[PDB]
Design a protein around this nucleic acid. Sequence first.
RNA 1: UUUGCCUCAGGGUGCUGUAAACAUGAAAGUAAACUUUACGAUCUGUUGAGGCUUAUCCCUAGUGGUAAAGUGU
RNA 2: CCUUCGAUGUCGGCUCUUCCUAUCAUUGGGACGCAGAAGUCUCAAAGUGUCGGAUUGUUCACCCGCUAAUAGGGAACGUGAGCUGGGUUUAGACCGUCGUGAGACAGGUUAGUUUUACCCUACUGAUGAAUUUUAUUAUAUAUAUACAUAUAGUAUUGUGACAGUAAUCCAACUUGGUACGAGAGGAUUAGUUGGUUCAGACAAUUGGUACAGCAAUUGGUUGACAAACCAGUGUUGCGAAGCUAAGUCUGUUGGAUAAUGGCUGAACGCCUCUUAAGCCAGAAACCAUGCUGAUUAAACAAUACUAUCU
RNA 3: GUCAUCUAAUUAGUGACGCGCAUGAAUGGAUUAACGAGAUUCCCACUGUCCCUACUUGCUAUCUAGCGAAACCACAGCCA
RNA 4: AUGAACUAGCCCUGAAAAUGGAUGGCGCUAAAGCGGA
RNA 5: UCUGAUGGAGGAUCGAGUUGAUACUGACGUGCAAAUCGUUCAUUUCAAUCACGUUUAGGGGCGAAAGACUAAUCGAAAAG
Lengths: 380, 132, 62
Amino acid sequence: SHRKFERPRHGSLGFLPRKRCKRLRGKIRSFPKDDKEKPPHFTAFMGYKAGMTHIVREVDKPGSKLHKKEIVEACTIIECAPMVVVGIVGYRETPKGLRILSTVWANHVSDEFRRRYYKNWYKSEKKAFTKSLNVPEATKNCLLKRIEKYCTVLRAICHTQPSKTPLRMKKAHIMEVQINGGSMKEKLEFVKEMLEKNLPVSTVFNPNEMIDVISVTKGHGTKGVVSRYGVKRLPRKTHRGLRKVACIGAWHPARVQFQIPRHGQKGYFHRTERNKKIYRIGLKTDKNSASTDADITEKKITPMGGFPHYGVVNEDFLLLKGCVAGTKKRPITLRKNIVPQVSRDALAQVSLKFIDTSSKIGHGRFQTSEEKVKYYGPLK
Amino acid sequence: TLKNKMRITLSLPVGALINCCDNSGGKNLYIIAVQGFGSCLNRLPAASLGDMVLATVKKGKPDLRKKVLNAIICRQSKAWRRHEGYYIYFEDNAGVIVNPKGEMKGSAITGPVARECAELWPKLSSAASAIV
Amino acid sequence: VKTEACSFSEYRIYPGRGQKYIARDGKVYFYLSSKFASLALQKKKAAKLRWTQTWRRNNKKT
RNA sequence: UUUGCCUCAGGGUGCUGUAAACAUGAAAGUAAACUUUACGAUCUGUUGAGGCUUAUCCCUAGUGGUAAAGUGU
RNA sequence: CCUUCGAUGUCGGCUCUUCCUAUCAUUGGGACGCAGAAGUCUCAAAGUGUCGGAUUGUUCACCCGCUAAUAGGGAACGUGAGCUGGGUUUAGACCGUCGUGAGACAGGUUAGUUUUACCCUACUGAUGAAUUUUAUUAUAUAUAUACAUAUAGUAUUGUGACAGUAAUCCAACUUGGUACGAGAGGAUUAGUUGGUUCAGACAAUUGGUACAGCAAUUGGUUGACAAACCAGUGUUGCGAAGCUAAGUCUGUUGGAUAAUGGCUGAACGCCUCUUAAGCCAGAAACCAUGCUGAUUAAACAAUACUAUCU
RNA sequence: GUCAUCUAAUUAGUGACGCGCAUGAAUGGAUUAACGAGAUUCCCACUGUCCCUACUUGCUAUCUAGCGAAACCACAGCCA
RNA sequence: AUGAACUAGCCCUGAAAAUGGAUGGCGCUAAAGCGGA
RNA sequence: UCUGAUGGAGGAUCGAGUUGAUACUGACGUGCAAAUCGUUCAUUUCAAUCACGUUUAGGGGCGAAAGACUAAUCGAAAAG
């Protein structure tokens, strides 16, 4: 018979199967739709989760209970060392999907990039990419001309530089960033120009821009149904334990449906979360990257004592409003919005007054070690 | 006349005994239902500072007892975050008896009143002596 | 940046850090950390805690 | 898997809350000698001291180490 | 009384999923005895949601209250190797009526053991080879070829068939005391700011947690101090890190349609949305987009390097 | 059952009413202080019973070396 | 070559149920449907 | 009559042990165990508890009464 009381199902069937992700790196399922009118531009970037802090910003929402008051918001720090463009991939449309016409490479690739092709780089003689890079310039131009003639989707292969981060990993994460913009000719020229140089975050993203974040959630091994799906605990009197689903299906159909929550892997899931706003693109060069006009102190983004479980952010970074899936050190793919947003949140010009740099270990009271030593005075 | 209350951490579920903190004659309020609460299967309706609830008084004037009446929460002992950055909590739970339209039945508030409740209920703030 | 002062200790509280408490009389106490909040709630006097600025001032040590 | 890593150490950041020892130092009072000597919870100074802090914290071409080279193609 | 009496565990509740539509609300419409407001009848529509409690074992019922709505049903009266065991329905006992009696009672009452999964499948996650009678949406300097092409190992970047899929509803204010109305009252739609339920994450802050740690302290014990130890975590404060919600963040727009309203337009000189041909606008529905998986395709491409090899 | 009371809400409890299906006097009637691992209702205190779950400790589970059963079994095991 | 009223063939409304679904399936309309020959 | 002591009665009280077994309807339920384990609970000057000896034997015994017990056997034991 029917349920006595109706309540919505536990969890979303749109994130099935809740299995471990195939890879650690976040993978773009689909790039933003190409607009021919816009000039050629990159559409994605990769960084690493460093940690979280909180900022103070003045609200400019008329008719809101906050409005002219200053509020505190949590933010995520993603260290974004400049990416390196090393390749070009041409895609053409077929009834079977997108087909690679060819990928051409730059004249030189770094050992960091080459390490990604090796499971044991230390004991190998590192012969990868050693003789295919001497291809003639005429053949390169032939392949590029054929790409221009027959391809409709252009992607640039670019890789991270983990040596610029505190990561123990040395092999670079390499991905394809789709070039969206003008004609095929303009796209090819745009990528050819920076076929070998660094790609900083600032050329891909602007401040106060909404982006999507693609990453892999924090792993938790196999978890019970209570934690994995949020089902209600059975009463204390339950004979064979209470942390489970009581009825896993009616008599008929004489099977267990795939919609029934069960114990299994929780976390380490691929997730694409939309509409994270860039609050600040902090440059590596300037020493006041964490300073504001209302603070005028000289301090960088890294909290005193370092970012817990990550290290020190010594490179370009961006301050994302809110939270982002993954652990510290996790590679995080930043993607441009699939369609540009015209909402007031997306277009708002953020004016942040204070960026916290107190110790994230324990309850830090000071923003800088200099302030700490000044407050305490001389010791033994 | 503006009900953009802004979310306050839910305290005081159904069955909570709070103080009256007014001169209406009642001494305590037994929260009975929370106005605007929707449908969740085993969820107890719960109230926050600016919330209008339905209550009965268990101690106070006999003329006030044994009846269903409206109250507005004014003081909440559970810590809630206001957006300035910090957390706030009173040391007791208290609400005032009001007409369903939101106008007080008593005339004065004993202790401090939360600013969030005060700006939601204007004529309540006038009776409030200290708005914190 | 403008900082507040803790009520139990004298430490400066930066925005987005502490907590507030209102007593019956309606006056507000400002607490930087859960430790200070707990000590004030068990109503321990800061003057008799060796590590507090109140103690340092009282034993002419600042 | 040798500008790496592990290790310990130094530093940072925190947590706790002022270590042990000494002091014609204090201490409610007590007893015992021809004005000092004994007992004394506890307190004070040296002492925001001492202890701990990655094992899943941060930094350091700081110390020492980094091992046999087996299996498949 | 057709199947089960060499046994298909017999009420209700809890938990959990799915399905139906004879639609309660939400979307878009048509009619009204339709001024507005509210409501009633009705169409396409099952995408989303249908609650907290008092009494009773109850289903049913009945009130209190919120709500937008608190719609009706199925799945062996869904669901007992999922629970519970209050009722019914063994043996103890009590009352009433009946019986000479033993005893009976859809009369009441109280106490009364709820067994087994390690098998197959299903489901949930986790490894993983092998795949030529196999595959091809090409490969070759405005030019040939299936009478062709493809060995294999590692490794990366990808394609994405197919399967799943997600958001939902409300309030206040502005429009506006406006349209309408004699007045009493009093909108729709759009916008703004919030909120409910749900979903996916996250720990800067707040809170929770302690067999990191530091401190205090009771009983005992090491001659004392110190250092400790035992009391199945001795007990107390505080308690980083990590987990965690009660905390924080995020949660699209296109195509083609249904109902319906229309265009042109005969049949039928007129008329007619077509109950011909030919067209349009159009819904929380559908299909895409987006998202998840893709040893779901025993799938495949490009690239990098190589194996005595060709 | 009806009337009061208890609650916001009472098929529960208590106090009353009594043409009582079918009460009633050693089939003992009525009432009783004290007593009860007896049945029942309410109140205060209390709390993870619950809102709504989270963290955590021991012993298992798990993997390994060793040891090593049983029930059940027509044949078997994807669905509409 | 007009207006009516009947009549009966096929078609349509009447015609709503629960796992997903069944003229046996595919599908079929110049039938691979219906009534003949 | 009242007050303070003294005194030490009671099928008096709490409570270990003993003797039991209220609840979790906990664990276990292919058990450590054909009735156990844990916590909780009842009981301790008396109708108290224990041992050995001795009596009562099957349509019989024995029963502070449950058709209870009479060697894991009881609305008629076990053996032939």
